[PDB]
Design a protein around this ligand. Sequence first.
Ligand SMILES: [Zn+2]
Ligand SMILES: [Zn+2]
Lengths: 8, 55
Amino acid sequence: ARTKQTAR
Amino acid sequence: ECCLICRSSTAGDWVNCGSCGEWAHFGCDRRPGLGAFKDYAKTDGLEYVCPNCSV
Ligand SMILES: [Zn+2]
Ligand SMILES: [Zn+2]
């Protein structure tokens, strides 16, 4: 899948 | 913008639904059998389909 990991 | 399940945009592991194109924290989807974010994040990883789009 299209994914992302965020931290803001 | 935000998680289709919890409606926040807090930090974490995110998957995009391949049906509706909305985003969700992978951790907010508690359906049995989903496995781990890893199996989605890699190339040719599984497709994520959110709870509403699934059936
Ligand atoms: Zn969420
Ligand atoms: Zn969906």
